[PDB]
């Protein structure tokens, strides 16, 4: 069972989709996966330590960077321990374990003050990510000595040689000028079309019957597992598509009569174009009716030709000659882990004997299994180009080597790669499931990532809902309760936002009656509907309480987002500084998340070289359909507001440096803010250029009261500019027009340092950019090819440097021209 069904309805409301539903299925694949995921779930649930699971220590194995070492040049770290009224400092060694620190206190568990963050485990104090954050931001480590959480709170509820042929019967649309239509049928494996047959064109009426056998060149014997029957309707524009796996989840050849509801084309290779899901909109979609009733040493010239192809970028095209060379010299190629994506692409997957030879090659995998982990290389074997389950599994096996900290870095992109999986049950989906069940911070973000996709994609909601349910059946009752609180808040907040948008007109000014109407709605919610407290979706250590209703406003944007301010539910909190969240409707925040995540990856790439470029990747989490939560960075303003304070537009190079010294109460702070500005500006010019999101308006660029520059709103994105480096930015650097400056020559120094460092991880970035465009930007070959030129691929560090320095010179030669042209719109 009775309560066994009351739990499934809880699960459904938490997921945002009912997995028990068989209304849009043509086989048991979803149900088989739903059952197949119980084993890996139970295995991980039974293997995790309960107390370390409860305290989820956020830690790293990585060295403490050189810049944070200067911050503690004394070899002594101060930790202040609180208990009721008492608070006492303790001199600690960076290498000390929290247990050894605790020993020193009791001679005279640890929880971060105001956060659900624990400094527990056999890790040194220099390796805790909260300690590193204090070091970087020049903060004092305030901790409280309390009782550990009880693990009983994390408990789980007890659970032939013939040619292939397809008969196409016809097509039917409920509602349709007098045009012409035909059906194109493709045998696809990865992005490769193994065979293509078409029907004769028939007039485009609402019922189009053919009754034709489409006999392909491929033998049934030769059909590879994970091959798709891609059925397309053309009129020459592609209007409809649908896919069918030819070999099912139990290795059987697909047979019988099918009535498939198809996807419409709107306005190129999207992840949506690969889905095995059928369109659930039965009343308005197009349907298709089908029937299935079926060694000497290498010459130097060649080794060099082979090395030159192996060394090449992931977006460099492999010619037939390259593919034959790679395939012929496959045992030499196997010696290079970097050759693996190229070598697996040179395989004729439509030939059973070649696939067997490929599997034989995969068995001689000592040099791959030995090799150090390259995530960029691993991600390449997980994109749209690899559809083989054994090729993909060797990538997933490399991921198992990642520490939890690295999982969170790639998690979003890893969840998106599940879209490229032929089957619902994959090594990738099981890996994500196991990692989320092991660490609460991974499971927290995995929930929201999986949820954002269920609510915004019809193409993949069915697969992601089976993965979420498998996670939510193992995360444990406390985790379940947290998600419940969080989902309740978002739902009532979404309600409020839609009502606010409706009252307002299209007029620039947000009505003062509307901002009062909001104040009344938020008061009528807090009284008996809204939960007393919830975990912040984009910062799960941080718990929000009751709204500060007098601080809540509607932002003067045409999407009318909600500026919300909450009290911190934690009594031990160091400050009375409110928690600020932007609740926005209309924008699909997945793109923003994807860009904000690449920003974090670029920060790690930089850390690898002891380089800190002070980026500010603010919290941003897609919570549902066209909705989400955005972190409000406290003590921050837009460059456009600084440009409207002393100037007051309907600009001036002076105002920024003027605003910085006005905001800094001391000279050693103002100059620190100027270096912070020059590093953050360098960082954002570099990051923004390689991503091609450089040409921005002053409005979408912010700065903190500490000179920390940061771009915002990457949603959407004649005279062009590579990045934003307007004369006001140059004024803080102490220059005008074409003039040298100690800070400016240093800014060029940081840019080149940062740019050449990003170029050291070219492959990782290209693959992430491509994956982002494929799974989050609904793209073409040209749009993807941008980053190749941006990262000056195949070029030496000198030519590459001459490129970025000229980019700086473009912004200087253009001044405020492109900036004013942005304002000329308004
Ligand atoms: C509403 O549209 C967006 C805004 C931001 C964004 C992010 C951070 C901040 C803001 N907007 C505004 N803001 C801010 C303004 N004043 N203060 C200081 C305070 N309190 C903070 C931020 O920190 C990010 N993405 C968006 O669209 C996808």
Tab-separated table of C-alpha atoms in Angstrom, residues 195-500:
chain	number	residue	atom	x	y	z
A	195	UNK	CA	23.667	2.348	-46.092
A	196	UNK	CA	20.991	4.743	-47.409
A	197	UNK	CA	17.778	3.716	-49.353
A	198	UNK	CA	14.907	6.076	-50.343
A	199	UNK	CA	11.297	5.682	-51.497
A	200	UNK	CA	9.969	7.149	-54.745
A	201	UNK	CA	8.320	10.587	-54.138
A	202	UNK	CA	4.527	10.531	-53.589
A	203	UNK	CA	2.193	13.610	-53.320
A	204	UNK	CA	2.134	15.190	-49.829
A	205	UNK	CA	-1.459	14.342	-48.731
A	206	UNK	CA	-2.313	13.566	-45.036
A	207	UNK	CA	-2.102	9.746	-45.591
A	208	UNK	CA	0.828	8.647	-47.840
A	209	UNK	CA	0.977	4.894	-48.649
A	210	UNK	CA	3.909	3.169	-50.438
A	211	UNK	CA	3.921	-0.531	-49.324
A	212	UNK	CA	7.581	-0.861	-50.513
A	213	UNK	CA	10.439	-3.194	-49.546
A	214	UNK	CA	13.615	-1.136	-49.090
A	215	UNK	CA	16.474	-3.627	-49.634
A	216	UNK	CA	19.886	-2.374	-48.314
A	217	UNK	CA	23.414	-3.371	-49.427
A	218	UNK	CA	24.260	-4.541	-45.839
A	219	UNK	CA	23.877	-8.229	-44.889
A	220	UNK	CA	22.003	-8.907	-41.599
A	221	UNK	CA	25.141	-10.818	-40.374
A	222	UNK	CA	27.108	-7.501	-40.718
A	223	UNK	CA	24.697	-5.320	-38.622
A	224	UNK	CA	26.680	-3.889	-35.654
A	225	UNK	CA	25.131	-3.645	-32.125
A	226	UNK	CA	23.952	-0.086	-31.560
A	227	UNK	CA	23.076	0.471	-35.249
A	228	UNK	CA	20.016	2.713	-35.788
A	229	UNK	CA	17.330	2.593	-38.514
A	230	UNK	CA	17.140	6.370	-39.004
A	231	UNK	CA	13.869	7.111	-40.790
A	232	UNK	CA	13.514	10.576	-42.326
A	233	UNK	CA	10.689	12.438	-44.139
A	234	UNK	CA	11.748	14.947	-46.846
A	235	UNK	CA	9.788	17.303	-49.122
A	236	UNK	CA	14.597	19.318	-50.245
A	237	UNK	CA	13.850	19.951	-46.517
A	238	UNK	CA	13.946	17.370	-43.690
A	239	UNK	CA	10.714	17.764	-41.737
A	240	UNK	CA	10.494	14.581	-39.635
A	241	UNK	CA	12.772	11.976	-38.104
A	242	UNK	CA	12.598	8.876	-35.870
A	243	UNK	CA	15.149	6.163	-34.977
A	244	UNK	CA	14.859	2.469	-34.229
A	245	UNK	CA	17.679	0.289	-32.757
A	246	UNK	CA	18.028	-2.726	-35.189
A	247	UNK	CA	19.481	-4.923	-32.376
A	248	UNK	CA	17.655	-4.668	-29.010
A	249	UNK	CA	18.925	-4.718	-25.339
A	250	UNK	CA	18.834	-8.570	-25.416
A	251	UNK	CA	20.929	-8.792	-28.668
A	252	UNK	CA	17.914	-9.835	-30.793
A	253	UNK	CA	17.262	-8.519	-34.313
A	254	UNK	CA	14.299	-6.108	-34.303
A	255	UNK	CA	11.163	-7.712	-35.758
A	256	UNK	CA	7.515	-7.015	-36.569
A	257	UNK	CA	5.160	-4.086	-37.227
A	258	UNK	CA	5.942	-0.616	-35.891
A	259	UNK	CA	3.919	2.566	-35.689
A	260	UNK	CA	6.443	5.275	-34.781
A	261	UNK	CA	5.512	8.819	-33.750
A	262	UNK	CA	8.170	11.169	-35.146
A	263	UNK	CA	9.973	14.387	-34.207
A	264	UNK	CA	9.437	17.607	-36.149
A	265	UNK	CA	12.414	19.748	-37.335
A	266	UNK	CA	12.568	23.397	-35.986
A	267	UNK	CA	14.712	26.476	-36.904
A	268	UNK	CA	23.737	20.185	-38.381
A	269	UNK	CA	24.127	17.365	-35.766
A	270	UNK	CA	22.198	17.648	-32.435
A	271	UNK	CA	22.086	14.886	-29.760
A	272	UNK	CA	18.288	14.995	-30.131
A	273	UNK	CA	18.661	13.675	-33.748
A	274	UNK	CA	20.044	10.374	-32.367
A	275	UNK	CA	17.319	9.519	-29.823
A	276	UNK	CA	15.562	6.082	-29.875
A	277	UNK	CA	12.649	7.741	-28.044
A	278	UNK	CA	9.396	8.248	-30.042
A	279	UNK	CA	7.421	11.550	-29.944
A	280	UNK	CA	4.824	11.229	-27.065
A	281	UNK	CA	2.521	13.887	-28.703
A	282	UNK	CA	0.409	11.176	-30.506
A	283	UNK	CA	-2.448	13.587	-31.489
A	284	UNK	CA	-0.274	16.038	-33.497
A	285	UNK	CA	2.890	14.161	-34.516
A	286	UNK	CA	3.683	12.402	-37.816
A	287	UNK	CA	3.693	8.639	-37.661
A	288	UNK	CA	5.525	6.075	-39.843
A	289	UNK	CA	4.470	2.472	-40.313
A	290	UNK	CA	7.118	-0.134	-41.040
A	291	UNK	CA	7.628	-3.923	-41.038
A	292	UNK	CA	10.733	-6.007	-40.093
A	293	UNK	CA	10.625	-9.782	-41.009
A	294	UNK	CA	14.416	-10.537	-41.260
A	295	UNK	CA	55.556	-7.943	-38.169
A	296	UNK	CA	58.150	-6.041	-40.367
A	297	UNK	CA	59.353	-2.616	-38.963
A	298	UNK	CA	57.576	0.553	-40.154
A	299	UNK	CA	59.245	2.772	-42.861
A	300	UNK	CA	60.247	6.164	-41.317
A	301	UNK	CA	58.070	8.144	-43.836
A	302	UNK	CA	55.031	6.085	-42.762
A	303	UNK	CA	55.690	6.230	-38.948
A	304	UNK	CA	55.986	10.008	-39.351
A	305	UNK	CA	52.812	10.140	-41.510
A	306	UNK	CA	51.063	8.049	-38.761
A	307	UNK	CA	52.439	10.270	-35.881
A	308	UNK	CA	51.306	13.420	-37.771
A	309	UNK	CA	47.757	12.013	-37.930
A	310	UNK	CA	47.785	10.782	-34.242
A	311	UNK	CA	49.038	14.247	-33.025
A	312	UNK	CA	46.280	16.117	-34.927
A	313	UNK	CA	43.240	17.790	-33.128
A	314	UNK	CA	39.870	15.965	-32.400
A	315	UNK	CA	38.046	18.098	-35.056
A	316	UNK	CA	40.652	17.494	-37.771
A	317	UNK	CA	39.089	15.381	-40.558
A	318	UNK	CA	40.449	11.880	-41.208
A	319	UNK	CA	40.644	11.123	-44.973
A	320	UNK	CA	40.147	7.587	-46.427
A	321	UNK	CA	44.023	7.374	-46.763
A	322	UNK	CA	44.389	8.272	-43.013
A	323	UNK	CA	41.805	5.633	-42.066
A	324	UNK	CA	43.497	2.874	-44.144
A	325	UNK	CA	46.973	3.795	-42.744
A	326	UNK	CA	45.641	3.722	-39.121
A	327	UNK	CA	43.793	0.413	-39.745
A	328	UNK	CA	46.696	-1.324	-41.552
A	329	UNK	CA	49.120	-0.186	-38.754
A	330	UNK	CA	46.598	-0.767	-35.913
A	331	UNK	CA	49.083	-2.607	-33.634
A	332	UNK	CA	51.533	0.316	-33.849
A	333	UNK	CA	48.590	2.748	-33.355
A	334	UNK	CA	47.493	0.772	-30.265
A	335	UNK	CA	50.844	1.783	-28.641
A	336	UNK	CA	49.590	5.385	-28.570
A	337	UNK	CA	46.577	6.047	-26.233
A	338	UNK	CA	46.071	9.332	-28.202
A	339	UNK	CA	45.457	7.357	-31.451
A	340	UNK	CA	42.455	5.471	-29.914
A	341	UNK	CA	39.643	7.910	-31.030
A	342	UNK	CA	41.231	8.116	-34.572
A	343	UNK	CA	41.817	4.354	-34.784
A	344	UNK	CA	38.268	3.526	-33.596
A	345	UNK	CA	36.943	5.960	-36.269
A	346	UNK	CA	38.957	4.262	-39.028
A	347	UNK	CA	36.996	0.982	-38.338
A	348	UNK	CA	34.471	-0.297	-40.937
A	349	UNK	CA	31.693	-1.083	-38.366
A	350	UNK	CA	29.364	-2.366	-41.129
A	351	UNK	CA	31.608	-5.487	-41.597
A	352	UNK	CA	31.398	-8.268	-38.972
A	353	UNK	CA	34.956	-9.580	-39.644
A	354	UNK	CA	36.476	-6.084	-39.084
A	355	UNK	CA	34.458	-5.640	-35.852
A	356	UNK	CA	35.888	-9.049	-34.640
A	357	UNK	CA	39.474	-7.827	-35.479
A	358	UNK	CA	38.623	-4.567	-33.547
A	359	UNK	CA	37.554	-6.647	-30.481
A	360	UNK	CA	40.775	-8.720	-30.754
A	361	UNK	CA	42.664	-5.390	-30.664
A	362	UNK	CA	40.670	-4.254	-27.567
A	363	UNK	CA	41.782	-7.428	-25.732
A	364	UNK	CA	45.530	-6.456	-26.170
A	365	UNK	CA	44.822	-3.360	-24.035
A	366	UNK	CA	47.866	-3.302	-21.698
A	367	UNK	CA	49.203	0.149	-22.839
A	368	UNK	CA	45.643	1.692	-22.536
A	369	UNK	CA	44.974	0.117	-19.033
A	370	UNK	CA	48.532	1.216	-17.918
A	371	UNK	CA	48.409	4.898	-19.300
A	372	UNK	CA	47.760	7.897	-16.995
A	373	UNK	CA	44.194	9.293	-17.158
A	374	UNK	CA	43.498	11.885	-19.898
A	375	UNK	CA	39.865	13.115	-19.413
A	376	UNK	CA	39.946	14.956	-22.770
A	377	UNK	CA	40.919	11.703	-24.505
A	378	UNK	CA	38.344	9.751	-22.428
A	379	UNK	CA	35.519	12.224	-23.319
A	380	UNK	CA	36.342	11.754	-27.078
A	381	UNK	CA	35.491	8.022	-26.787
A	382	UNK	CA	32.085	9.070	-25.261
A	383	UNK	CA	30.813	11.512	-27.970
A	384	UNK	CA	28.409	11.043	-30.961
A	385	UNK	CA	31.198	9.336	-33.044
A	386	UNK	CA	31.416	6.199	-30.862
A	387	UNK	CA	28.433	3.971	-30.734
A	388	UNK	CA	30.240	0.701	-29.902
A	389	UNK	CA	29.549	-0.502	-26.330
A	390	UNK	CA	33.109	-1.982	-25.924
A	391	UNK	CA	34.923	1.114	-27.272
A	392	UNK	CA	32.849	3.298	-24.876
A	393	UNK	CA	33.406	0.977	-21.853
A	394	UNK	CA	37.245	1.450	-22.011
A	395	UNK	CA	36.531	5.228	-21.661
A	396	UNK	CA	34.190	4.633	-18.649
A	397	UNK	CA	36.874	2.348	-17.152
A	398	UNK	CA	39.323	5.305	-17.266
A	399	UNK	CA	36.811	7.512	-15.419
A	400	UNK	CA	36.650	5.113	-12.398
A	401	UNK	CA	40.171	6.506	-11.547
A	402	UNK	CA	38.794	10.052	-10.911
A	403	UNK	CA	38.624	11.377	-7.393
A	404	UNK	CA	35.189	12.899	-6.288
A	405	UNK	CA	36.514	16.466	-6.789
A	406	UNK	CA	37.228	15.685	-10.494
A	407	UNK	CA	33.870	13.933	-10.896
A	408	UNK	CA	32.091	17.246	-9.940
A	409	UNK	CA	34.228	19.083	-12.494
A	410	UNK	CA	33.079	16.835	-15.371
A	411	UNK	CA	29.668	15.626	-13.990
A	412	UNK	CA	27.513	17.958	-16.066
A	413	UNK	CA	29.325	17.012	-19.335
A	414	UNK	CA	29.322	13.342	-18.294
A	415	UNK	CA	25.454	13.441	-17.705
A	416	UNK	CA	25.101	15.096	-21.186
A	417	UNK	CA	27.218	12.230	-22.774
A	418	UNK	CA	24.400	9.791	-21.745
A	419	UNK	CA	22.544	11.315	-24.763
A	420	UNK	CA	25.194	9.714	-27.068
A	421	UNK	CA	24.616	6.240	-25.611
A	422	UNK	CA	22.794	3.779	-27.985
A	423	UNK	CA	21.134	1.949	-24.992
A	424	UNK	CA	19.418	3.173	-21.804
A	425	UNK	CA	21.628	0.806	-19.698
A	426	UNK	CA	25.238	1.787	-20.258
A	427	UNK	CA	28.570	1.695	-18.359
A	428	UNK	CA	28.334	5.593	-18.300
A	429	UNK	CA	24.818	5.628	-16.682
A	430	UNK	CA	25.920	2.964	-14.087
A	431	UNK	CA	29.132	4.988	-13.361
A	432	UNK	CA	27.153	8.226	-12.723
A	433	UNK	CA	24.628	6.260	-10.573
A	434	UNK	CA	27.461	4.648	-8.429
A	435	UNK	CA	29.303	8.033	-8.002
A	436	UNK	CA	26.178	9.885	-6.898
A	437	UNK	CA	25.341	7.132	-4.386
A	438	UNK	CA	28.916	7.248	-2.955
A	439	UNK	CA	29.187	11.081	-2.384
A	440	UNK	CA	26.233	13.344	-1.347
A	441	UNK	CA	27.654	16.394	-3.163
A	442	UNK	CA	27.799	14.344	-6.476
A	443	UNK	CA	24.295	12.870	-5.892
A	444	UNK	CA	22.940	16.359	-5.084
A	445	UNK	CA	24.164	17.809	-8.441
A	446	UNK	CA	23.362	14.595	-10.355
A	447	UNK	CA	19.635	14.956	-9.189
A	448	UNK	CA	19.384	18.586	-10.453
A	449	UNK	CA	21.329	17.805	-13.707
A	450	UNK	CA	19.140	14.781	-14.470
A	451	UNK	CA	16.012	16.833	-13.427
A	452	UNK	CA	16.790	19.854	-15.637
A	453	UNK	CA	16.993	17.449	-18.640
A	454	UNK	CA	13.750	15.489	-17.787
A	455	UNK	CA	11.817	18.802	-17.627
A	456	UNK	CA	13.352	20.363	-20.771
A	457	UNK	CA	13.954	17.363	-23.182
A	458	UNK	CA	11.246	15.066	-24.559
A	459	UNK	CA	14.011	13.284	-26.542
A	460	UNK	CA	15.786	11.974	-23.394
A	461	UNK	CA	13.388	12.411	-20.404
A	462	UNK	CA	12.526	8.657	-20.446
A	463	UNK	CA	16.195	7.500	-20.079
A	464	UNK	CA	17.171	10.219	-17.512
A	465	UNK	CA	14.011	9.440	-15.420
A	466	UNK	CA	15.085	5.767	-15.133
A	467	UNK	CA	18.584	6.948	-14.004
A	468	UNK	CA	17.073	9.475	-11.456
A	469	UNK	CA	14.691	6.855	-9.985
A	470	UNK	CA	17.654	4.436	-9.546
A	471	UNK	CA	19.563	7.267	-7.757
A	472	UNK	CA	16.544	8.344	-5.602
A	473	UNK	CA	15.939	4.692	-4.524
A	474	UNK	CA	19.447	4.596	-2.990
A	475	UNK	CA	20.267	8.183	-1.776
A	476	UNK	CA	18.562	7.565	1.640
A	477	UNK	CA	15.563	9.184	3.417
A	478	UNK	CA	17.475	12.383	4.589
A	479	UNK	CA	18.584	13.105	1.008
A	480	UNK	CA	14.983	12.322	-0.178
A	481	UNK	CA	13.638	14.814	2.402
A	482	UNK	CA	16.082	17.561	1.276
A	483	UNK	CA	15.072	17.164	-2.376
A	484	UNK	CA	11.387	17.278	-1.321
A	485	UNK	CA	11.892	20.619	0.507
A	486	UNK	CA	13.874	22.040	-2.481
A	487	UNK	CA	11.289	20.917	-5.127
A	488	UNK	CA	8.377	22.387	-3.030
A	489	UNK	CA	10.079	25.856	-2.876
A	490	UNK	CA	10.882	25.999	-6.664
A	491	UNK	CA	7.246	24.976	-7.547
A	492	UNK	CA	5.616	27.767	-5.458
A	493	UNK	CA	8.309	30.224	-6.566
A	494	UNK	CA	7.635	29.342	-10.286
A	495	UNK	CA	3.899	29.973	-9.629
A	496	UNK	CA	4.672	33.454	-8.196
A	497	UNK	CA	6.974	34.391	-11.123
A	498	UNK	CA	4.350	33.492	-13.878
A	499	UNK	CA	1.726	35.654	-12.059
A	500	UNK	CA	4.149	38.623	-11.828
